[PDB]
């Protein structure tokens, strides 16, 4: 499994849409931890 929340839609409400979208980038941030 991709271990990521699938992108919202399916007639989802606009306020929920905002919170949910932020979580997408949040998980993606864990996949970008280059050796600094």
Angle at alpha carbon of residue 32, lines to 2 and 22, rounded to 5°? 70
Burial class (CB in 10 A: 0-12, 13-18, 19+), 20: middle
Placement of tokens 């919202």 in the chain: 8
Four-point Cα dihedral 17, 19, 20, 21, nearest 10: 80
Q: How far apart are CA 33 and CA 13, in angstroms?
A: 32
DSSP class per residue in 1-36: ---SPPP--TT--HHHHHHHHHHHHHHHHHT-----
How far apart, in Å, are the Cα atoms of 34 and each of 2, 4, 10, 26? 20, 19, 35, 16
CA 23 from chain centre, in angstroms, equals 4
């Amino acid at each position: 499994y991709p271990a990521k929340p699938e992108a919202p839609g399916e007639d989802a409400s606009p306020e929920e849409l905002s919170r949910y979208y932020a979580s997408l980038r949040h998980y993606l941030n864990l996949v970008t931890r280059q050796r600094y």
